[PDB]
Scaffold this motif. Structure first.
Motif, short mmCIF file in Angstrom:
data_model
loop_
_atom_site.label_atom_id
_atom_site.label_comp_id
_atom_site.label_asym_id
_atom_site.label_seq_id
_atom_site.Cartn_x
_atom_site.Cartn_y
_atom_site.Cartn_z
N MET A 35 30.83 8.81 -2.01
CA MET A 35 31.51 9.75 -2.91
C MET A 35 31.42 9.31 -4.36
O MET A 35 31.25 10.13 -5.26
CB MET A 35 32.99 9.92 -2.52
N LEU A 38 27.81 10.15 -5.62
CA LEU A 38 27.59 11.57 -5.84
C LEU A 38 28.32 12.11 -7.06
O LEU A 38 27.74 12.80 -7.86
CB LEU A 38 27.98 12.38 -4.60
N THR A 39 29.60 11.76 -7.19
CA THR A 39 30.42 12.24 -8.29
C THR A 39 30.02 11.56 -9.59
O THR A 39 30.05 12.17 -10.66
CB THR A 39 31.91 12.00 -8.02
N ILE A 116 28.47 21.11 3.88
CA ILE A 116 27.90 21.44 2.59
C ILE A 116 26.43 21.05 2.54
O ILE A 116 25.61 21.81 2.04
CB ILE A 116 28.72 20.80 1.45
N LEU A 207 35.37 19.12 -3.30
CA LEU A 207 35.54 18.20 -4.41
C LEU A 207 37.03 18.10 -4.74
O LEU A 207 37.56 17.02 -5.03
CB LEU A 207 34.77 18.70 -5.62
N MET A 210 39.00 16.18 -2.34
CA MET A 210 38.68 14.77 -2.51
C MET A 210 39.47 14.17 -3.66
O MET A 210 39.89 13.00 -3.60
CB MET A 210 37.17 14.56 -2.69
O1 LIG Z 1 33.10 16.31 -2.60
C1 LIG Z 1 31.90 16.61 -3.18
C2 LIG Z 1 31.22 17.77 -2.82
C3 LIG Z 1 30.00 18.08 -3.41
C4 LIG Z 1 29.45 17.22 -4.37
C5 LIG Z 1 28.22 17.52 -4.96
C6 LIG Z 1 27.60 16.56 -5.98
C7 LIG Z 1 26.38 16.83 -6.59
C8 LIG Z 1 25.85 15.91 -7.50
C9 LIG Z 1 24.64 16.17 -8.13
O2 LIG Z 1 24.13 15.27 -9.01
C10 LIG Z 1 23.96 17.36 -7.88
C11 LIG Z 1 24.49 18.28 -6.98
O3 LIG Z 1 23.85 19.45 -6.72
C12 LIG Z 1 25.70 18.02 -6.33
C13 LIG Z 1 30.14 16.05 -4.71
C14 LIG Z 1 31.36 15.75 -4.12
#
Ligand SMILES: Oc1ccc(/C=C/c2cc(O)cc(O)c2)cc1
Ligand SMILES: Oc1ccc(/C=C/c2cc(O)cc(O)c2)cc1
Lengths: 230, 9, 234, 9
Positions: A35, A38-39, A116, A207, A210
């Motif tokens: 997480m 990604l974030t 997702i 998100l 989260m």
């Molecule tokens: O809980 C979450 C759900 C979805 C996401 C997605 C993150 C993300 C990051 C990137 O650089 C590009 C993208 O297309 C998506 C992050 C956290």
């Protein structure tokens, strides 16, 4: 006031020149771990997306408050179509960065995440079935920025959108498509944006759930981008 | 908003 | 099969002929609204429309061609989108208002009656203003609504669906051409129409979240069919 | 599912 002046070819060159850079992940593996990546990746991309938005013809013509509204509405959509575009060459995988290629099952490292992932993977498959082009990609992405929050002589933004449709069509004619094929492909392309909106709404909820549970700290930018939807 | 600032910067 | 052989005109009339009726609400003008009673009105209405939608869908060319499982999935995905585009369409001639039913025409101040409802009203009203700004035609309307049914859940699954969708694209172009739009206006307008669907999707997702929180707060009893259309989304 | 039954009738 001058984006309406561009040629189709100039619209394409403009959009291509405006493309944000491709960033790497901090990656060197838990729910917190992933997480954060990604974030954290998302926060950094967002900063580069703003520079990109500002290079989209027609955008800088808008008031500051309208630019904020458009980006707040569209940001995750734009992030995701980027992701999908990048992952198009990697069937079954999501290319968040060049050093972060995640297969479908790794989405289960985080709760709720795989659902997702599946939608992102299916959109990517669809780009691949369509043989989506880079020139088409950048038009689609520009369309999302200008369209997603637009409904909120107020007719200028719609002229810019028309110019971008003209550009998509120019690309297709150039590729030797017949009239009937241009139209059908144009429709095919745009219906994707309905799936992208859906993925963004779902991404936004996840998100946000989260943020609450608190698995990981989100940047201030991210929190405000998130809270525009709450 | 931070976004306000990014846009101006 | 027989769907892919339809002329454009045959497509249009098949879809016009399939149109559900405009249903009445249970609105009782002797009593004031509460959050609970206004939500009851909207959910009671949605439930009745669903039965018509289900029969509408069966008349959309190429739809019955699919497995039962495929029909269920598409309808489960698009039902609220489809209810919502109808609402926006009925509300076209009533600027500033939403025509839920001929006996249930609400403005945003009435929307404020239900917690969280006015935000969705505002989006629906704005989309309605968009239909008005483009002078959306009923022939175009029925095309769009069919595109939602076939498209919305199509990537949560193939070729046959896409065939019908391409055929509906031919139909829209034909209608616009027949209406005297230029070759350029045609592609421009086709794009404007389709972009609408991104907004319809948005509003559906928000309405879905809102409907869900009414259920989870026991604001109003939902029909079993509605509970199942809703569960499909979580 | 009700819809599944409804789609047949
Ligand atoms: O809980 C979450 C759900 C979805 C996401 C997605 C993150 C993300 C990051 C990137 O650089 C590009 C993208 O297309 C998506 C992050 C956290
Ligand atoms: O034609 C229509 C018939 C019914 C409706 C209902 C919408 C709606 C939106 C919500 O957020 C909650 C809810 O319980 C219902 C919309 C259109």
């Amino acid at each position: 006031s001058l984006a309406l002046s561009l040629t189709a070819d100039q619209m394409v060159s403009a959009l291509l020149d405006a493309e944000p850079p491709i960033l790497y992940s901090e990656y060197d593996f838990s729910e917190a771990s992933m997480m954060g990546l990604l974030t954290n990746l998302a926060d950094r991309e967002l900063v580069h997306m703003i520079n990109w938005a500002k290079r989209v013809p027609g955008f800088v013509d808008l008031t500051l408050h309208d630019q904020v509204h458009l980006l707040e509405c569209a940001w995750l959509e734009i992030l995701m179509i980027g992701l999908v575009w990048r992952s198009m060459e990697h069937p079954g995988k999501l290319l968040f960065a060049p050093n972060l290629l995640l297969d479908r099952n790794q989405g289960k490292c985080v709760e709720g995440m795989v659902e997702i992932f599946d939608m992102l993977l299916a959109t990517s498959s669809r780009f691949r079935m369509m043989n989506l082009q880079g020139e088409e990609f950048v038009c689609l992405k520009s369309i999302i920025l200008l369209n997603s929050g637009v409904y909120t002589e107020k007719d200028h933004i719609h002229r810019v959108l028309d110019k971008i449709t003209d550009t998509l069509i120019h690309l297709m004619a150039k590729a030797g498509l017949t009239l009937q094929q241009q139209h059908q492909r144009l429709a095919q392309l745009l219906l994707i944006l309905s799936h992208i909106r859906h993925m963004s709404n779902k991404g936004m909820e996840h998100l946000y759930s989260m943020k609450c549970k608190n698995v990981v700290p989100l940047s201030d930018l991210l929190l405000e981008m998130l809270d525009a939807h709450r | 908003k931070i976004l306000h600032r990014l846009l101006q910067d």
